[PDB]
Symmetry: none
């Protein structure tokens, strides 16, 4: 199916923390305060509900490593960079990794303990936002 | 690409504050009133729009530390001393640090609060000036 250019938005319960998934040139994955060139992602279907996410600007694939820690890799590998896209009741998406048994998330090392301490991960629900300006 | 020898010029709104980024022998980074041997910088491309800045006279690399505070280090480290060079509408350049999420600036500790209080940093727009006398 068609390719999608979007900005993945998430936030904490307070709301004051607006976070757009950003893939940096140095391979780091963090939170951007608003839509930017580093947060513009290319979401491509690889299988049924499975997708690959690539930073348009950094040209790095969103990949999952140890503990579900996210990073941007220049080289794509299905097992670490392909995720099952699922819509949640809140209308946001969760991107799950089969191999790592965890959803993509911008949670910190300390926050990741909540996946088995409460059964969830902070900053793991993402709403694909269309860019505020046409682009392709 | 080729190496560039320049003097980075900036100023305050009053204009009365002419500032050339100076890298001192004692590692301190401050404002020079005019072009001098301490303000002669070597700007070298490391990647696409990424550059390294070294004081010719002090032989110190322009590096960013805590709060974006600038200092001159004898030892180069990409994460703290490499910046993305971007041209602004005023024709001046802003040198951004991916790791520190801030632009190079000669702002004081008190002035740095303006980055999130207004979204900018004083003395962060720099115009690379060619030396007024040939040199290499």
């Amino acid at each position: 199916d068609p390719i999608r250019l979007r900005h993945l938005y998430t936030s904490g319960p307070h709301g004051l923390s607006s976070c757009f998934l950003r893939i940096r040139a140095d391979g780091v994955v963090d939170c951007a305060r608003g839509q930017s060139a580093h947060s513009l992602l290319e979401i491509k279907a690889v299988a049924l509900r499975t997708v690959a996410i690539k930073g348009v600007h950094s040209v790095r694939y969103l990949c999952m490593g140890a503990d579900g820690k996210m990073q941007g890799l220049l080289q794509y590998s299905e097992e670490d960079c392909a995720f099952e896209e699922e819509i949640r009741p809140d209308g946001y998406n969760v991107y799950r990794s089969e191999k790592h048994r965890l959803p993509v998330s911008l949670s910190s090392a300390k926050q990741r303990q909540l996946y088995k301490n409460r059964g969830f991960l902070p900053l793991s629900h993402f709403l694909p936002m269309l860019p505020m300006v046409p682009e392709e």
